[PDB]
Tab-separated table of C-alpha atoms and ligand atoms in Angstrom:
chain	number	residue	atom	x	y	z
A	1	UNK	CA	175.088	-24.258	35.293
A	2	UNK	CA	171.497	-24.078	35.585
A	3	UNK	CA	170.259	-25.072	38.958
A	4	UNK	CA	166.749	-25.507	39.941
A	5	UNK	CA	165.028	-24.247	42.593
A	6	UNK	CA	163.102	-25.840	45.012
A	7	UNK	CA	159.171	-25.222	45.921
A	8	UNK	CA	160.049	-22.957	48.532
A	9	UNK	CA	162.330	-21.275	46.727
A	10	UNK	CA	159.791	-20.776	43.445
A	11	UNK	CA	157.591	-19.076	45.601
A	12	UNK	CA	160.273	-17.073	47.299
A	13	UNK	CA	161.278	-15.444	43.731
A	14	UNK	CA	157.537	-14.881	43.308
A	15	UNK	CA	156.893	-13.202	46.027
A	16	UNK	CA	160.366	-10.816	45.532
A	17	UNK	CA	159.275	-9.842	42.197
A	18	UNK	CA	155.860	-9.144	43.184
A	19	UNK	CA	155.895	-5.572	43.972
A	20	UNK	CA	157.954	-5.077	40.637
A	21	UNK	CA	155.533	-6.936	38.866
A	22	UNK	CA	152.431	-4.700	39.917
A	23	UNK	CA	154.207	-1.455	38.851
A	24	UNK	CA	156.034	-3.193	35.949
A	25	UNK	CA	156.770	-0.190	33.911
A	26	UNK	CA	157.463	2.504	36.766
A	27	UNK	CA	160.091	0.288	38.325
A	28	UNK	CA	161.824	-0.317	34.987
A	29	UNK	CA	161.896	3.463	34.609
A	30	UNK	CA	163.770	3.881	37.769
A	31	UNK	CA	165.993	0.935	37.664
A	32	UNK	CA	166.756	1.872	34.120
A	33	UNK	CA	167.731	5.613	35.105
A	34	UNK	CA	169.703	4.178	37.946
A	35	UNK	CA	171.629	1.868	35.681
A	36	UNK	CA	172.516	4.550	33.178
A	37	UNK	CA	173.312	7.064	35.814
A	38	UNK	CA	176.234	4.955	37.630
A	39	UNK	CA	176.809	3.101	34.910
A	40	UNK	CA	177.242	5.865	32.188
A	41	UNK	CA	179.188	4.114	29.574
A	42	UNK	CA	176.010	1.879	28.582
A	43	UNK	CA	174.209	4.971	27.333
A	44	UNK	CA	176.046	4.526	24.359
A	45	UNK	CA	175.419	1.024	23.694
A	46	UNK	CA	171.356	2.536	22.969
A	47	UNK	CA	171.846	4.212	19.330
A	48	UNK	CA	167.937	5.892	20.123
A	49	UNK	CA	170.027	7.061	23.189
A	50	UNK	CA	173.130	7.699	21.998
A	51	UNK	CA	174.469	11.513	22.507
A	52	UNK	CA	172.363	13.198	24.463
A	53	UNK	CA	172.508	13.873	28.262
A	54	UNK	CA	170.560	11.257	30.219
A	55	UNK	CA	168.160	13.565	31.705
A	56	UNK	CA	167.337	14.656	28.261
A	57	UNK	CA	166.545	11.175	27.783
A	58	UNK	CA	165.180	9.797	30.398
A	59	UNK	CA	161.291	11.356	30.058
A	60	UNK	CA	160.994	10.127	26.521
A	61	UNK	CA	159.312	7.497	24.650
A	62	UNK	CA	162.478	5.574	23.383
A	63	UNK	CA	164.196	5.760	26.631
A	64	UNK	CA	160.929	3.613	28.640
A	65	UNK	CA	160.596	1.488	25.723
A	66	UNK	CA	164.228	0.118	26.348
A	67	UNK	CA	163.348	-0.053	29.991
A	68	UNK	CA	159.819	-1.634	30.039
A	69	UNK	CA	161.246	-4.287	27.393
A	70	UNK	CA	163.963	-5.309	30.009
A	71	UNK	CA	161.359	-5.626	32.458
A	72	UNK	CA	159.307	-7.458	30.292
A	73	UNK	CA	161.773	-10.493	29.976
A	74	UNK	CA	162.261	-10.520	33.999
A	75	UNK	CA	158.564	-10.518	34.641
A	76	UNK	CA	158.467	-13.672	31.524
A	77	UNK	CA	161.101	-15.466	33.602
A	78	UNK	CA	159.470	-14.933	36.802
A	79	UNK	CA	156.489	-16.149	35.093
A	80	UNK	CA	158.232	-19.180	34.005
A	81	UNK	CA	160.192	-20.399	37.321
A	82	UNK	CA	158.734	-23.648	37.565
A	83	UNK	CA	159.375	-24.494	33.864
A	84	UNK	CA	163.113	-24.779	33.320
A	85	UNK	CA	162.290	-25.068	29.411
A	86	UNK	CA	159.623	-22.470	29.172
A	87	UNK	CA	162.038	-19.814	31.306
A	88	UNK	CA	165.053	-21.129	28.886
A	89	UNK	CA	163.090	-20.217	26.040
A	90	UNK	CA	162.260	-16.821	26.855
A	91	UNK	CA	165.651	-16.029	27.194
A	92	UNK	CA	166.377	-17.616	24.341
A	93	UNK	CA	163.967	-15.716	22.024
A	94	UNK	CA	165.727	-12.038	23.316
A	95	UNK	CA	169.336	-13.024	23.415
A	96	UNK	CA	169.413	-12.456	19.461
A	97	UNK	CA	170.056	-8.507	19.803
A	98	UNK	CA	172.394	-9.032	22.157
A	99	UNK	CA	174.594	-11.796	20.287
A	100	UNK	CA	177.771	-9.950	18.983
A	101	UNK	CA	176.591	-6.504	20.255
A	102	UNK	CA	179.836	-5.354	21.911
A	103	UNK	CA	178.354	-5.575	25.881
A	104	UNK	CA	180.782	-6.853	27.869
A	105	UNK	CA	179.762	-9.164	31.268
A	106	UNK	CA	180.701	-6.249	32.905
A	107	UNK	CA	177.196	-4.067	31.395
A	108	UNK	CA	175.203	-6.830	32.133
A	109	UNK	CA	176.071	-8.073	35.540
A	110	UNK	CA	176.260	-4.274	36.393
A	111	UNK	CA	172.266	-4.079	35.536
A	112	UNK	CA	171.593	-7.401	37.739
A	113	UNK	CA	173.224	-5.265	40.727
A	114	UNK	CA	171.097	-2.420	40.035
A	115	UNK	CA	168.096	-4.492	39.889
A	116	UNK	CA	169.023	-6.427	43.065
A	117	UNK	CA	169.750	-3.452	44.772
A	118	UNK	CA	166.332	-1.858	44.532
A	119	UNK	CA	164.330	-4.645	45.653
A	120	UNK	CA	165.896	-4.660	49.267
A	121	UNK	CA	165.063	-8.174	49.375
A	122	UNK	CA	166.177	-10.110	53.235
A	123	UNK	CA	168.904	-13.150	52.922
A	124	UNK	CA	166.354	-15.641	52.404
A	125	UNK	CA	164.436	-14.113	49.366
A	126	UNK	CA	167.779	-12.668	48.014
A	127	UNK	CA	168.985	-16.558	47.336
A	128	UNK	CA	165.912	-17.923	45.968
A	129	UNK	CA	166.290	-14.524	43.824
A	130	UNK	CA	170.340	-14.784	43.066
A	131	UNK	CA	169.541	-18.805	42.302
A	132	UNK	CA	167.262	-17.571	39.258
A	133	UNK	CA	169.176	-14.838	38.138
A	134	UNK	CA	172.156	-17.369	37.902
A	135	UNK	CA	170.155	-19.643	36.066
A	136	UNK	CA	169.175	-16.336	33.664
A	137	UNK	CA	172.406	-15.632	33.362
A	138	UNK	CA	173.972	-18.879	32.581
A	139	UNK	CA	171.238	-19.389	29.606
A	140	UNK	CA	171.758	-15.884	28.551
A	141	UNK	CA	175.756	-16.162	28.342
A	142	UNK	CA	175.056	-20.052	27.190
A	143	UNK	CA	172.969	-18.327	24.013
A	144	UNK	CA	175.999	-15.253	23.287
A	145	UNK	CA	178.428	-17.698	23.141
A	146	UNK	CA	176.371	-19.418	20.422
A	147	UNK	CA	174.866	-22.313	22.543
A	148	UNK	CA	171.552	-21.403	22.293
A	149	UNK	CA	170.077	-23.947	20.533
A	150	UNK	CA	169.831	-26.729	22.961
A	151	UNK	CA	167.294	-23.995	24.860
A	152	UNK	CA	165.704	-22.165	21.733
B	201	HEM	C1	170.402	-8.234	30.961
B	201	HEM	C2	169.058	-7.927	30.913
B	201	HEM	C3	168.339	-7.613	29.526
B	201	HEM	C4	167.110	-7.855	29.041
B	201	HEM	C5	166.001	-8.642	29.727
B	201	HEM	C6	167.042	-7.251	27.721
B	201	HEM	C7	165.967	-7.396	26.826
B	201	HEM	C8	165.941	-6.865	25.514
B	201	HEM	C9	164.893	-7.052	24.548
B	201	HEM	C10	163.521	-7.672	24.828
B	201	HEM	C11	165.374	-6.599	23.350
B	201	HEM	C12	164.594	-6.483	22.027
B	201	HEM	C13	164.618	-7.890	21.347
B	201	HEM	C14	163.982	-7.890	19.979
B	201	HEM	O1	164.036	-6.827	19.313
B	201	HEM	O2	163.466	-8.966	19.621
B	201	HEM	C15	166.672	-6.006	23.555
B	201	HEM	C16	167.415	-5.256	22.623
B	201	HEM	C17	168.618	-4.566	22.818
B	201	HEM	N1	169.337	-4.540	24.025
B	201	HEM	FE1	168.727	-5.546	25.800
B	201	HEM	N2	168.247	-6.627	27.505
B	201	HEM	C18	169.038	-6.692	28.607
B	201	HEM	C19	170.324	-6.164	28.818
B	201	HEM	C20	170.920	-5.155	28.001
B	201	HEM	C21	172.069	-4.317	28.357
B	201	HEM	C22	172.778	-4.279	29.716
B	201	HEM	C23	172.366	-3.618	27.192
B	201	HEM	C24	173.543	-2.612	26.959
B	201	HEM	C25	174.311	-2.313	27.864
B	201	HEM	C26	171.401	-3.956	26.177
B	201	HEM	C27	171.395	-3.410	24.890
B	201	HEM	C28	170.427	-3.712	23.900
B	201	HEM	C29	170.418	-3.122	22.523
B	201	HEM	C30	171.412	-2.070	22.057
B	201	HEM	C31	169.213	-3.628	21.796
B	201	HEM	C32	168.723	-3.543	20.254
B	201	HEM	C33	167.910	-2.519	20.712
B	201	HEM	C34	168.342	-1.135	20.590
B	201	HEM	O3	168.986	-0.793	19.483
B	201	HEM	O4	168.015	-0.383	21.476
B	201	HEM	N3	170.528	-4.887	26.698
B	201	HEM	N4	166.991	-6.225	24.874
């Protein structure tokens, strides 16, 4: 379910993202690579990606498009943590794409762990972090199974 956070907590996920958030692009890049590299059966899922080596890929303008637009959407939500409806809409608005695109759970929860790998974050920021990323993820799964519209 979604669960919201308390004030503490708000400013926790702030302050986790922040260092993301001031190299927005150049994280997303890395995380991206990261993602594709242990996680190679995603590559596929790109069609601008699709059949070429990933270090072919991974300098070119397609490739940090797909990345930076990822990123995007995370630095939107942490944006909108203290409006459950405003961070319920951005997900909303770029679940579309993803409705009936054959990604399993799997993909997606395997980006999360990339993502919450490379921030390092201690126990106390990692909770405030995981409590957001729930509620992401219970919107976003909420909107592929075609209950979207009670947050669109
Ligand atoms: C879970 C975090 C994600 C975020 C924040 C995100 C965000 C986005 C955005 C902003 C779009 C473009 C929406 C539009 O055109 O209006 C998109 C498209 C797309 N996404 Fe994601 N996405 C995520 C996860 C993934 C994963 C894990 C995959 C595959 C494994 C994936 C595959 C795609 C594909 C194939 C497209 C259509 C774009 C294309 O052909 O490249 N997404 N996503």
């Amino acid at each position: 379910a979604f669960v919201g956070l308390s004030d503490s907590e708000e400013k926790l996920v702030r302050d986790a993202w922040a260092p993301i958030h001031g190299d927005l692009q150049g994280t997303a890049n890395t995380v991206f690579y990261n993602y594709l590299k242990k996680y190679p059966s995603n590559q596929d899922k790109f069609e601008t990606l699709k059949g070429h080596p990933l270090d072919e890929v991974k300098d070119t303008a397609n490739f940090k498009l797909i990345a930076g637009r990822i990123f995007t959407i995370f630095d939107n939500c942490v944006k909108n943590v203290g409006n459950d409806k405003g961070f319920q809409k951005v997900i909303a608005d770029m679940s579309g794409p993803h409705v009936a695109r054959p990604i399993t759970h799997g993909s997606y929860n395997d980006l999360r762990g990339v993502i919450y790998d490379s921030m390092h974050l201690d126990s106390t920021h990692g909770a405030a972090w995981n409590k957001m990323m729930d509620n992401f993820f219970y919107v976003f799964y909420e909107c592929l199974d075609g209950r979207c519209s009670q947050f669109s």
